[PDB]
Symmetry: C2
Subunit: 79 residues, 2 copies
């Protein structure tokens, strides 16, 4: 687990140009999670131009939960 903590600190430093020096783990909780990712390609109209988007939705139905993880423009729809 200390291995996972050192990784987390490494990643944070790598990502935000930090220099946190890992000392010790003081507490760990862990949850096993399942669910379904939906990668939905959809057309939507943006101020009159029909465009194509990809949305990543994470759904955990065993706890009645969902959330939008990613939303990105793919390009224009054909016309």
């Amino acid at each position: 687990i200390e291995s996972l903590a050192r990784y987390a600190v490494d990643e944070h430093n790598k990502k935000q140009n930090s220099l946190l020096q890992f000392e010790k783990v003081v507490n760990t909780k862990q949850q096993v999670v399942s669910g379904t990712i939906y990668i939905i390609t959809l057309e939507a109209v943006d101020g009159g131009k029909k465009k194509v988007y990809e949305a990543k939705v994470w759904e955990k139905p065993w706890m009645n939960f969902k959330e939008l993880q990613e939303f990105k423009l793919i390009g224009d729809a054909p016309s």
Copy 2:
């Protein structure tokens, strides 16, 4: 599934002050995912001050994968 797509577009609009008008789903892929979230509380030294951080690590060992999901300062460590 159209329900999930309308949700995704609603959330994107809600989050980035957009007005995308959902038209239709054109393609859906879905993946069932499991794994373990680790919420690791750790001490690390930031320029000489020992502080306390909470890191959220998602691990999917069935595909030899992990990633840092959140990293936040909790406060100072006791001195």
